[PDB]
Amino acid sequence: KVFGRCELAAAMKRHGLDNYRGYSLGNWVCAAKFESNFNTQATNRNTDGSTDYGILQINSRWWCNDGRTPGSRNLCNIPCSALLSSDITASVNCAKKIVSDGNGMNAWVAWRNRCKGTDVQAWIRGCRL
Template sequence: MKAAGILALIISLSIIAESKVYTRCKLAKIFVKAGLDNYEGFTLGNWICMAYYESHYNTTAQKILEDGSVDYGIFQINSFTWCRNVRRQQKNHCHVACSALVTDDLTDAILCAKKIVKETQGMNYWQRWKKHCEGKDMSEWKRGCEVS
């Protein structure tokens, strides 16, 4: 029993150690390289603003919702519709495990976010984007960043 407790502690510490919080400019570079700037008409500033308000740029952010689903990763992508976790039957439209959305490698999260924007009503999926970013000057979000 003691060994199981130690193993659980080691696993939880390794999860904490793997948590990455990007800086705004580092994220801007990653987003530009991934083709998010002007993707479906949304500027880089929209993506950076949305990621800030959804997760504060934390790759391992998770939020359990009242319906039992979970929002995952830097974009807070929901498990019920967009990814697969072990707890619920999901639609998994992004064809990805939810665990792939909470890693430092943002490839799966970005591909899924692109799918969400393309297949829904743009960035309206993200309520925090609607509240904090929609219709505002987005140029400040990339100011001071070299994003070529």
């Protein structure tokens, strides 16, 4: 599923990501935008042989199991494939865990480089929320 921008914002809010750990909805939307361009099926292989999955590019290195990342953890306790569904519940629950781990949204490099300190509100502009 490729979400629309306001469509995703509402899905994220519905799943209680808005202001989760103090991050406004616009941050989460910006993060989704630059991580997967809102596409729930996005996968990208990392140089270390791990793979990032889904709307938030959750990394098999720590967070999910894909069965091909030697020596990795599955800290969200899910198949990385669940991170690729139309329904974003699993991506949301697992992102909540990532974003609590100590570093806030800096765990997402696209957020740090492209969202952090920008006009993140604009991502939810015009949305019926």
